[PDB]
Design a binder for these strands. Structure first.
Ligand SMILES: [Mg+2]
Ligand SMILES: [Mg+2]
Ligand SMILES: [Mg+2]
Ligand SMILES: [Mg+2]
Ligand SMILES: [Mg+2]
Ligand SMILES: [Mg+2]
Ligand SMILES: [Mg+2]
Ligand SMILES: [Mg+2]
Ligand SMILES: [Mg+2]
Ligand SMILES: [Mg+2]
Ligand SMILES: [Mg+2]
Ligand SMILES: [Mg+2]
Ligand SMILES: [Mg+2]
Ligand SMILES: [Mg+2]
Ligand SMILES: [Mg+2]
Ligand SMILES: [Mg+2]
Ligand SMILES: [Mg+2]
Ligand SMILES: [Mg+2]
Ligand SMILES: [Mg+2]
Ligand SMILES: [Mg+2]
Ligand SMILES: [Mg+2]
Ligand SMILES: [Mg+2]
Ligand SMILES: [Mg+2]
Ligand SMILES: [Mg+2]
Ligand SMILES: [Mg+2]
Ligand SMILES: [Mg+2]
Ligand SMILES: [Mg+2]
Ligand SMILES: [Mg+2]
Ligand SMILES: [Mg+2]
Ligand SMILES: [Mg+2]
Ligand SMILES: [Mg+2]
Ligand SMILES: [Mg+2]
Ligand SMILES: [Mg+2]
Ligand SMILES: [Mg+2]
Ligand SMILES: [Mg+2]
Lengths: 152, 70, 117
RNA sequence: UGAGCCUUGAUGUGUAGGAUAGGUGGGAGGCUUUGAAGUGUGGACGCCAGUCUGCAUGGAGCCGACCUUGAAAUACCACC
RNA sequence: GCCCGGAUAGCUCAGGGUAGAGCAGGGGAUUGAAAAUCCCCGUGUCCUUGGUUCGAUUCCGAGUCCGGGCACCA
RNA sequence: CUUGAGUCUCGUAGAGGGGGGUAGAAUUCCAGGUGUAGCGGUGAAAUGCGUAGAGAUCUGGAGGAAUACCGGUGGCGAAGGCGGCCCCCUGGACGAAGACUGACGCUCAGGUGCGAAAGCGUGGGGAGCAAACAGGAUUAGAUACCCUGGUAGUCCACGCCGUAAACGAUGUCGACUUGGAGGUUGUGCCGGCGUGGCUUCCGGAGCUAACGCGUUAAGUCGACCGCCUGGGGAGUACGGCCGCAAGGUUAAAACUCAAAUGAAUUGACGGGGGCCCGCACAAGCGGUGGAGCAUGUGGUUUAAUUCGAUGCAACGCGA
């Protein structure tokens, strides 16, 4: 706001992995305050992904994550009526948040039977550069690339 | 604004020397003044305005010390 | 087709566009590149990045003659003056002189009228 | 400076594939110390993969069918 | 009638082991607008037919249309 | 008679004026070499120029207009105005000491002369700019602002015109009346100390409606001249004079209103300037506008569809 008084809110770990990153993933996926359903879906999808990939629950998830993180975005700035699209670096926390948001959004728009299966398919595709999340990441990167002349 | 690079300096030193020479030569000022026509009346008016503002600021700063703020 | 081993870079920077040419010591041109012909049009053509890209393209388009020693002459008030020289050095030439050769009337003719924007 | 007539040099790497091999061949023996496998060296082209190269050190080998190609290997060799 | 050239993306059209560049149109980035810039989307016997070739849009032959020069024009 | 006015001797500074010559930078055009696909312009575009070779860069040539830096709330002139360098003709100002004339002075109606820019006449010149004009845009329209071109004109000689916010919105001449900080230009004595001319800012008494002026007076006085008499009509009509014309100068009346006006004070407002705040934007999450139903309102209908709230701050409101 105009003040900048807030600190930072403490995030509790997930029950059976002890990672706050997966807890934030659950938080992003949760709707209507129904956290148990989100945890069931996340755990089932992670189990299926690890089984079809073979590595583990955690580092497979991280590998699928690092193929969606962006490193530059564009913000609009009007000067003389028209708007330039200035590219700007993305802080790491925003990187993770945008990555998770794009993965969940991509998995939401699919035609499978269960949400767990949808997330598993989208996340496996992300782990090897075929999901729509990777397409969105590349689109953002190239749009920022076009407006390099305005990077002050 | 003629800059010849001497022996064994980095580029940035030569570039800065060229920039200082250009700034002290008053090049961009001359090329920007001579872009549009200025009536003589406008020239005299702006010269007088600059002189008046300079004198007013000088008097203000001259008398500024004696007054104390807290 | 020929080797010169040294040449003069002429930079023509204005408020709308920047042009870069390479010539021999006698004035004959060897190649050229421009900021408007590098994919930038409109408000993007008058920026230092476009000048840098144009300098890169001009340097790439003159590889045949094998120039290694370079001289720079800059005229005009445009944004693309320092960027072009920096990119030219990054291309690998060694710069011997830098000069501002912008014209100055010593009175001259009568400039156009002021714009009432 | 444009065109023609000659003569020569190379140039022309679908796909297999040692092979920058165009249809067509008298035909698997010439080349080699009438300084040779491979070296240093300089040069032109090159889809830069692979030719070619003035000379020398160097010293005398490559070498033809032979199996992937439809074809056979400037092994001596004609024509375009 | 004889000859000289061409027919390919919706349009303009480039190019013996191939179909291509741009613009037209759909949506999303995008905002109060067109810019602007992003991304994708097809748009194919290269007129048709036959003939050579280990396959032909890149070779030949003929028929449909169009342009140019000429002929016939009693 | 010499104290006001003027003459003579020596020097100083200065874009004061008229005439001629000449230099360098830059723009445009012509010719040629290199070289290749864009240039130019805008908020964004387009008209426009370019493969018939532009734009960029190099060399040679022609022509016209104006003089970067110095340059300064610096200088000169009655005002208008005056800016590269050199020569010829020429006006004024100031200073230092001295000799001379002896009131020869101040002001001035009519009158005479000078007078920015645009404009008019005859003849030359024409690079750049640019009324009128044409095209491209913007817009509800756009006879505009913006872009691309462009003719009179701007330049020279001679002659008219006679007006400007021609302003210090402040007529000319003389005298007297506390201070401070500078600029520029002379001269005397030993960097210091004096003494003249012009000039910028601040301020005292006094003046003034206030704002402000304040030894360069809008203070205290004297001489002469010009002008004013509520706002429109109107600096207009008619007459005279002047002009080639455009028009200039002199200068009313009917009718109409009860005001028009100057300076300063408190607010409010600004597509004026600073410094802050609020789920006001930004970052997010979920909705409404589409469907069916509940409810309130408007309108329409009815015998009645009782009355009231009806921008935010009325519409599941009184109920
Ligand atoms: Mg807040
Ligand atoms: Mg202009
Ligand atoms: Mg003088
Ligand atoms: Mg003079
Ligand atoms: Mg030319
Ligand atoms: Mg004076
Ligand atoms: Mg004189
Ligand atoms: Mg006497
Ligand atoms: Mg008179
Ligand atoms: Mg005039
Ligand atoms: Mg005239
Ligand atoms: Mg005239
Ligand atoms: Mg004339
Ligand atoms: Mg117009
Ligand atoms: Mg013009
Ligand atoms: Mg005229
Ligand atoms: Mg008057
Ligand atoms: Mg007056
Ligand atoms: Mg007066
Ligand atoms: Mg007086
Ligand atoms: Mg005062
Ligand atoms: Mg008074
Ligand atoms: Mg009256
Ligand atoms: Mg009159
Ligand atoms: Mg009259
Ligand atoms: Mg006339
Ligand atoms: Mg009033
Ligand atoms: Mg008032
Ligand atoms: Mg205010
Ligand atoms: Mg305000
Ligand atoms: Mg928001
Ligand atoms: Mg609804
Ligand atoms: Mg009611
Ligand atoms: Mg009421
Ligand atoms: Mg309520």
């Amino acid at each position: 706001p105009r003040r900048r008084v807030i600190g930072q809110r403490k995030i509790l770990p997930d029950p059976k992995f002890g990672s706050e990153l997966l807890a934030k993933f659950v938080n992003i996926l949760m709707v209507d305050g129904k956290k148990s359903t989100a945890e069931s879906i996340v755990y089932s999808a992670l189990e299926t992904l690890a089984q079809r990939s073979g590595k583990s629950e955690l580092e497979a998830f991280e590998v699928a994550l690092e193929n969606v993180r962006p490193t530059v975005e564009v913000k609009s700035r009007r000067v003389g009526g028209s708007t330039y699209q200035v590219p700007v670096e993305v802080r790491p926390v925003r990187r993770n948040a945008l990555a998770m948001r794009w993965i969940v959004e991509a998995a939401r728009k699919r035609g499978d039977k269960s949400m767990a299966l949808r997330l598993a398919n989208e996340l496996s595709d992300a782990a090897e550069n075929k999901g729509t999340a990777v397409k969105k990441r590349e689109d953002v990167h190239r749009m920022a690339e076009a407006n390099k002349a305005f990077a002050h | 604004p003629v800059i010849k690079v001497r022996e064994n300096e980095p580029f940035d030193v030569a570039l800065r020397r060229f920039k200082r020479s250009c700034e002290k030569a008053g090049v961009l000022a001359e090329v920007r003044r001579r872009e549009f026509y200025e009536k003589p009346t406008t020239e005299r008016k702006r010269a007088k305005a600059s002189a008046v503002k300079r004198h007013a600021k000088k008097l203000a700063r001259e008398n500024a010390r004696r007054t104390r703020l807290y | 087709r020929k080797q010169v081993s040294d040449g003069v870079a002429h930079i023509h920077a204005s408020f709308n566009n920047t042009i870069v040419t390479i010539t021999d010591r006698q004035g004959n041109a060897l190649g050229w590149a421009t900021a408007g012909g590098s994919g930038f049009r409109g408000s993007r053509k008058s920026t230092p990045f476009a000048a840098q890209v144009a300098a890169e393209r001009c340097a790439d388009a003159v590889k045949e003659y094998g120039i290694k020693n370079l001289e720079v002459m800059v005229k005009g008030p445009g944004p693309g003056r320092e960027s072009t020289i920096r990119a030219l050095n990054a291309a690998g030439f060694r710069i011997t002189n830098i000069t501002d050769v912008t014209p100055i009337p010593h009175x001259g003719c009568r400039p156009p009228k002021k714009r009432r924007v």
